[PDB]
Protein backbone atom coordinates (compact mmCIF):
# COMPACT_ATOMS: atom_id res chain seq x y z
CA UNK A 1 0.00 0.00 0.00
CA UNK A 2 3.03 2.35 -0.47
CA UNK A 3 3.83 5.52 -2.50
CA UNK A 4 6.45 8.34 -2.61
CA UNK A 5 4.22 10.20 -0.28
CA UNK A 6 4.57 7.69 2.61
CA UNK A 7 8.18 8.89 3.42
CA UNK A 8 10.30 12.01 4.36
CA UNK A 9 13.36 12.68 2.18
CA UNK A 10 16.31 13.71 4.36
CA UNK A 11 19.89 13.44 2.84
CA UNK A 12 21.49 12.37 -0.47
CA UNK A 13 23.65 9.20 0.19
CA UNK A 14 24.76 8.08 -3.24
CA UNK A 15 24.19 8.96 -6.85
CA UNK A 16 25.03 6.78 -9.87
CA UNK A 17 23.85 7.71 -13.35
CA UNK A 18 20.97 5.14 -13.21
CA UNK A 19 19.62 6.61 -9.94
CA UNK A 20 20.04 8.04 -6.44
CA UNK A 21 19.99 6.60 -2.85
CA UNK A 22 18.41 8.83 -0.17
CA UNK A 23 18.04 8.46 3.67
CA UNK A 24 14.18 8.24 4.29
CA UNK A 25 11.69 8.22 7.17
CA UNK A 26 8.47 6.25 7.15
CA UNK A 27 5.76 8.65 8.46
CA UNK A 28 3.59 5.78 9.62
CA UNK A 29 6.26 3.85 11.70
CA UNK A 30 8.96 6.36 12.59
CA UNK A 31 11.77 4.19 11.06
CA UNK A 32 14.65 5.20 8.80
CA UNK A 33 15.51 3.44 5.59
CA UNK A 34 17.68 3.83 2.48
CA UNK A 35 15.63 4.43 -0.67
CA UNK A 36 17.08 3.68 -4.11
CA UNK A 37 15.09 5.71 -6.67
CA UNK A 38 15.43 4.86 -10.40
CA UNK A 39 13.89 6.99 -13.19
CA UNK A 40 11.90 4.42 -15.30
CA UNK A 41 12.86 5.92 -18.62
CA UNK A 42 16.61 6.23 -17.80
CA UNK A 43 16.45 2.47 -17.01
CA UNK A 44 14.65 1.62 -20.28
CA UNK A 45 16.95 3.97 -22.27
CA UNK A 46 20.31 2.87 -20.79
CA UNK A 47 19.07 -0.73 -20.96
CA UNK A 48 18.86 -1.59 -17.27
CA UNK A 49 15.53 -3.44 -17.24
CA UNK A 50 16.86 -7.02 -16.81
CA UNK A 51 19.25 -5.77 -14.09
CA UNK A 52 16.47 -4.10 -12.16
CA UNK A 53 14.32 -7.26 -12.08
CA UNK A 54 17.40 -9.22 -10.87
CA UNK A 55 17.90 -6.89 -7.95
CA UNK A 56 14.24 -7.02 -7.01
CA UNK A 57 13.95 -10.91 -7.04
CA UNK A 58 17.32 -11.27 -5.37
CA UNK A 59 16.43 -8.81 -2.59
CA UNK A 60 12.99 -10.47 -1.97
CA UNK A 61 14.18 -14.09 -1.85
CA UNK A 62 17.23 -13.46 0.45
CA UNK A 63 17.21 -13.68 4.21
CA UNK A 64 20.64 -13.37 5.70
CA UNK A 65 22.15 -11.05 8.28
CA UNK A 66 24.94 -9.72 6.05
CA UNK A 67 22.58 -8.98 3.19
CA UNK A 68 20.63 -5.73 2.95
CA UNK A 69 17.01 -6.66 3.72
CA UNK A 70 14.22 -5.20 1.50
CA UNK A 71 11.01 -3.86 3.20
CA UNK A 72 9.14 -2.46 0.13
CA UNK A 73 9.35 -2.06 -3.59
CA UNK A 74 6.76 0.07 -5.26
CA UNK A 75 6.49 2.09 -8.46
CA UNK A 76 5.10 5.34 -9.78
CA UNK A 77 4.19 6.68 -13.29
CA UNK A 78 7.93 7.61 -13.48
CA UNK A 79 9.94 5.92 -10.65
CA UNK A 80 11.02 2.54 -9.35
CA UNK A 81 11.83 2.50 -5.64
CA UNK A 82 13.46 0.00 -3.33
CA UNK A 83 13.11 0.76 0.37
CA UNK A 84 15.86 -1.14 2.18
CA UNK A 85 17.71 -1.32 5.54
CA UNK A 86 19.79 1.74 6.15
CA UNK A 87 23.53 0.90 6.57
CA UNK A 88 24.59 3.77 8.85
CA UNK A 89 28.35 3.03 8.84
CA UNK A 90 28.63 3.79 5.09
CA UNK A 91 30.87 2.12 2.50
CA UNK A 92 34.04 0.16 3.22
CA UNK A 93 35.43 2.24 0.45
CA UNK A 94 34.97 5.25 2.76
CA UNK A 95 36.82 3.67 5.73
CA UNK A 96 39.71 2.12 3.80
CA UNK A 97 40.16 5.59 2.07
CA UNK A 98 40.72 7.24 5.46
CA UNK A 99 42.69 4.46 7.30
CA UNK A 100 44.81 3.29 4.24
CA UNK A 101 44.95 -0.42 5.35
CA UNK A 102 43.01 -2.46 7.90
CA UNK A 103 44.73 -4.75 10.47
CA UNK A 104 44.66 -8.56 9.71
CA UNK A 105 42.00 -9.08 12.41
CA UNK A 106 39.66 -6.43 11.10
CA UNK A 107 40.11 -7.71 7.48
CA UNK A 108 39.65 -11.25 8.84
CA UNK A 109 36.33 -10.24 10.40
CA UNK A 110 34.88 -8.60 7.29
CA UNK A 111 36.08 -11.51 5.14
CA UNK A 112 34.35 -13.99 7.47
CA UNK A 113 31.02 -12.18 7.05
CA UNK A 114 31.43 -11.69 3.35
CA UNK A 115 32.20 -15.45 2.97
CA UNK A 116 29.16 -16.30 5.14
CA UNK A 117 26.90 -14.21 2.91
CA UNK A 118 28.29 -15.60 -0.36
CA UNK A 119 28.14 -19.12 0.80
CA UNK A 120 24.45 -18.53 1.41
CA UNK A 121 23.84 -16.88 -1.97
CA UNK A 122 25.64 -19.75 -3.70
CA UNK A 123 24.23 -22.69 -1.73
CA UNK A 124 20.78 -21.46 -0.87
CA UNK A 125 19.63 -19.06 -3.50
CA UNK A 126 21.75 -20.45 -6.31
CA UNK A 127 23.03 -16.93 -7.06
CA UNK A 128 26.51 -15.60 -8.01
CA UNK A 129 26.93 -11.99 -6.96
CA UNK A 130 29.51 -10.89 -9.62
CA UNK A 131 30.32 -7.33 -8.49
CA UNK A 132 32.05 -7.55 -5.12
CA UNK A 133 34.12 -4.43 -4.47
CA UNK A 134 34.63 -1.92 -1.68
CA UNK A 135 31.71 0.30 -2.83
CA UNK A 136 29.19 -2.53 -2.50
CA UNK A 137 30.30 -3.30 1.06
CA UNK A 138 28.83 -1.28 3.88
CA UNK A 139 28.51 -1.53 7.62
CA UNK A 140 25.40 -1.22 9.85
CA UNK A 141 25.10 0.62 13.19
CA UNK A 142 26.77 -2.28 14.98
CA UNK A 143 29.75 -2.58 12.47
CA UNK A 144 28.56 -5.72 10.69
CA UNK A 145 28.86 -6.06 6.92
CA UNK A 146 25.92 -5.41 4.70
CA UNK A 147 26.18 -6.20 1.03
CA UNK A 148 24.31 -3.63 -1.14
CA UNK A 149 23.51 -3.33 -4.95
CA UNK A 150 22.28 -6.62 -6.49
CA UNK A 151 21.66 -5.77 -10.15
CA UNK A 152 24.66 -7.73 -11.52
CA UNK A 153 23.77 -11.14 -9.96
CA UNK A 154 23.33 -14.19 -11.99
CA UNK A 155 20.22 -16.13 -10.95
CA UNK A 156 19.54 -19.90 -11.27
CA UNK A 157 23.25 -20.79 -11.16
CA UNK A 158 23.59 -24.09 -9.35
CA UNK A 159 26.82 -25.99 -8.58
CA UNK A 160 29.56 -25.47 -11.25
CA UNK A 161 27.03 -24.41 -13.93
CA UNK A 162 28.70 -21.83 -16.37
CA UNK A 163 27.71 -18.31 -17.74
CA UNK A 164 28.93 -15.61 -20.27
CA UNK A 165 27.86 -12.01 -19.60
CA UNK A 166 30.78 -9.61 -19.66
CA UNK A 167 30.08 -7.54 -16.48
CA UNK A 168 31.18 -6.29 -13.07
CA UNK A 169 33.77 -3.62 -12.41
CA UNK A 170 36.90 -3.33 -14.53
CA UNK A 171 39.30 -3.25 -11.60
CA UNK A 172 37.75 -6.49 -10.20
CA UNK A 173 37.22 -8.72 -13.24
CA UNK A 174 38.60 -12.27 -13.01
CA UNK A 175 41.03 -13.58 -15.61
CA UNK A 176 38.51 -16.10 -16.94
CA UNK A 177 36.07 -13.21 -17.53
CA UNK A 178 38.77 -11.20 -19.40
CA UNK A 179 39.76 -14.39 -21.30
CA UNK A 180 36.27 -14.35 -22.73
CA UNK A 181 35.57 -17.82 -21.27
CA UNK A 182 32.43 -19.33 -19.76
CA UNK A 183 32.77 -18.88 -15.97
CA UNK A 184 31.26 -20.04 -12.72
CA UNK A 185 30.69 -18.87 -9.17
CA UNK A 186 34.48 -18.89 -8.42
CA UNK A 187 34.49 -15.33 -9.90
CA UNK A 188 33.09 -14.33 -6.48
CA UNK A 189 36.18 -15.83 -4.83
CA UNK A 190 38.42 -13.83 -7.18
CA UNK A 191 36.45 -10.63 -6.12
CA UNK A 192 36.84 -11.61 -2.50
CA UNK A 193 40.56 -11.92 -3.07
CA UNK A 194 40.78 -8.42 -4.59
CA UNK A 195 38.90 -6.94 -1.59
CA UNK A 196 40.91 -8.78 1.08
CA UNK A 197 44.00 -7.66 -0.92
CA UNK A 198 42.90 -4.00 -0.76
CA UNK A 199 42.01 -4.24 2.96
CA UNK A 200 45.26 -5.69 4.01
CA UNK A 201 47.48 -4.15 1.32
CA UNK A 202 46.02 -0.68 0.88
CA UNK A 203 45.80 -0.95 -2.89
CA UNK A 204 44.43 -2.94 -5.77
CA UNK A 205 46.42 -5.97 -6.76
CA UNK A 206 46.56 -4.73 -10.40
CA UNK A 207 46.37 -1.00 -11.26
CA UNK A 208 46.43 1.14 -14.39
CA UNK A 209 43.96 3.94 -15.23
CA UNK A 210 43.70 2.56 -18.77
CA UNK A 211 41.46 -0.54 -18.89
CA UNK A 212 43.46 -2.42 -21.44
CA UNK A 213 46.66 -1.95 -19.42
CA UNK A 214 44.81 -3.08 -16.32
CA UNK A 215 43.30 -6.13 -18.17
CA UNK A 216 46.79 -7.04 -19.33
CA UNK A 217 48.15 -6.90 -15.74
CA UNK A 218 45.26 -9.15 -14.63
CA UNK A 219 45.90 -11.85 -17.24
CA UNK A 220 49.70 -11.60 -17.26
CA UNK A 221 51.24 -10.64 -13.82
CA UNK A 222 51.75 -12.41 -10.48
CA UNK A 223 50.60 -10.40 -7.50
CA UNK A 224 53.05 -8.54 -5.32
CA UNK A 225 53.14 -9.07 -1.60
CA UNK A 226 54.12 -6.33 0.89
CA UNK A 227 56.64 -7.72 3.45
CA UNK A 228 54.24 -6.72 6.26
CA UNK A 229 51.86 -9.56 5.17
CA UNK A 230 51.83 -12.62 7.51
CA UNK A 231 52.28 -16.04 5.96
CA UNK A 232 48.58 -17.15 6.40
CA UNK A 233 47.27 -13.96 4.70
CA UNK A 234 49.91 -14.31 1.88
CA UNK A 235 48.61 -17.82 1.33
CA UNK A 236 44.98 -16.88 1.25
CA UNK A 237 45.53 -14.01 -1.15
CA UNK A 238 47.70 -16.33 -3.33
CA UNK A 239 44.91 -18.91 -3.43
CA UNK A 240 41.95 -16.53 -3.92
CA UNK A 241 43.76 -14.85 -6.80
CA UNK A 242 44.99 -17.96 -8.69
CA UNK A 243 44.21 -17.00 -12.29
CA UNK A 244 42.87 -20.39 -13.36
CA UNK A 245 39.47 -20.72 -11.54
CA UNK A 246 39.90 -24.56 -11.23
CA UNK A 247 43.00 -23.90 -9.18
CA UNK A 248 41.44 -21.07 -7.11
CA UNK A 249 40.51 -21.54 -3.44
CA UNK A 250 36.69 -22.05 -3.42
CA UNK A 251 36.90 -23.13 -7.04
CA UNK A 252 36.08 -26.77 -6.37
CA UNK A 253 32.84 -28.52 -5.57
CA UNK A 254 33.19 -27.56 -1.79
CA UNK A 255 32.82 -23.85 -2.79
CA UNK A 256 32.89 -21.54 0.33
CA UNK A 257 33.77 -24.56 2.53
CA UNK A 258 37.26 -24.64 1.08
CA UNK A 259 37.72 -20.96 2.15
CA UNK A 260 36.30 -21.41 5.68
CA UNK A 261 38.79 -24.10 6.42
CA UNK A 262 41.90 -22.16 5.33
CA UNK A 263 44.36 -21.42 8.20
CA UNK A 264 43.81 -17.72 7.69
CA UNK A 265 40.35 -18.31 9.27
CA UNK A 266 41.60 -20.76 12.02
CA UNK A 267 39.58 -20.31 15.19
CA UNK A 268 36.81 -18.34 13.62
CA UNK A 269 33.64 -20.26 14.50
CA UNK A 270 31.46 -20.00 11.43
CA UNK A 271 28.21 -20.59 13.28
CA UNK A 272 28.98 -17.59 15.59
CA UNK A 273 29.95 -15.50 12.60
CA UNK A 274 26.35 -16.20 11.22
CA UNK A 275 24.65 -15.65 14.60
CA UNK A 276 26.59 -12.38 15.01
CA UNK A 277 28.36 -13.27 18.20
CA UNK A 278 31.78 -12.09 17.08
CA UNK A 279 32.77 -8.56 18.30
CA UNK A 280 32.94 -6.06 15.46
CA UNK A 281 36.34 -4.52 15.50
CA UNK A 282 34.97 -1.07 14.60
CA UNK A 283 31.76 0.24 16.08
CA UNK A 284 30.46 3.20 14.01
CA UNK A 285 30.19 6.38 16.21
CA UNK A 286 26.81 7.77 15.23
CA UNK A 287 25.01 10.27 17.49
CA UNK A 288 21.50 9.66 16.05
CA UNK A 289 19.44 7.71 13.56
CA UNK A 290 20.23 10.31 10.86
CA UNK A 291 23.93 11.11 11.44
CA UNK A 292 25.48 10.69 7.91
CA UNK A 293 29.12 11.24 9.00
CA UNK A 294 30.41 8.09 7.12
CA UNK A 295 29.02 9.23 3.77
CA UNK A 296 30.95 11.55 1.46
CA UNK A 297 29.98 15.21 1.75
CA UNK A 298 29.91 15.46 -2.07
CA UNK A 299 26.44 13.81 -1.73
CA UNK A 300 25.07 14.62 1.75
CA UNK A 301 25.81 18.31 1.27
CA UNK A 302 23.48 18.23 -1.81
CA UNK A 303 20.05 19.80 -1.52
CA UNK A 304 16.87 17.77 -2.22
CA UNK A 305 8.14 4.41 -19.15
CA UNK A 306 6.25 1.12 -18.92
CA UNK A 307 4.50 -0.66 -16.00
CA UNK A 308 6.72 -3.34 -14.40
CA UNK A 309 4.35 -6.21 -13.70
CA UNK A 310 4.47 -7.40 -10.07
CA UNK A 311 7.42 -5.18 -9.22
CA UNK A 312 5.57 -4.13 -6.06
CA UNK A 313 6.54 -5.99 -2.89
CA UNK A 314 6.17 -5.76 0.91
CA UNK A 315 7.81 -7.71 3.74
CA UNK A 316 5.98 -6.95 7.01
Amino acid sequence: RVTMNEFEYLKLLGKGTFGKVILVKEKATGRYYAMKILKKEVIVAKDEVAHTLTENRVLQNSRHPFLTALKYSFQTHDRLCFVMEYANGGELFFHLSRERVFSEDRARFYGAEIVSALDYLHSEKNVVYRDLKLENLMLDKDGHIKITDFGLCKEGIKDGATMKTFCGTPEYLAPEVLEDNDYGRAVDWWGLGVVMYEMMCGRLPFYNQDHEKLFELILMEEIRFPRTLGPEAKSLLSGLLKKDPKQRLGGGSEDAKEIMQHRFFAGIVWQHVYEKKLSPPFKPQVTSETDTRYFDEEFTAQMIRPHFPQFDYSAS
Partner: peptide
Protein backbone atom coordinates in the same frame (compact mmCIF):
# COMPACT_ATOMS: atom_id res chain seq x y z
CA UNK B 1 43.20 6.60 -2.39
CA UNK B 2 41.88 4.99 -5.54
CA UNK B 3 39.17 6.79 -7.47
CA UNK B 4 35.59 5.45 -7.10
CA UNK B 5 34.89 2.73 -9.71
CA UNK B 6 31.91 2.01 -11.92
CA UNK B 7 29.80 -1.16 -12.45
CA UNK B 8 28.98 -1.94 -16.17
CA UNK B 9 27.82 -4.82 -18.42
CA UNK B 10 28.53 -5.31 -22.21
Amino acid sequence: GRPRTTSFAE
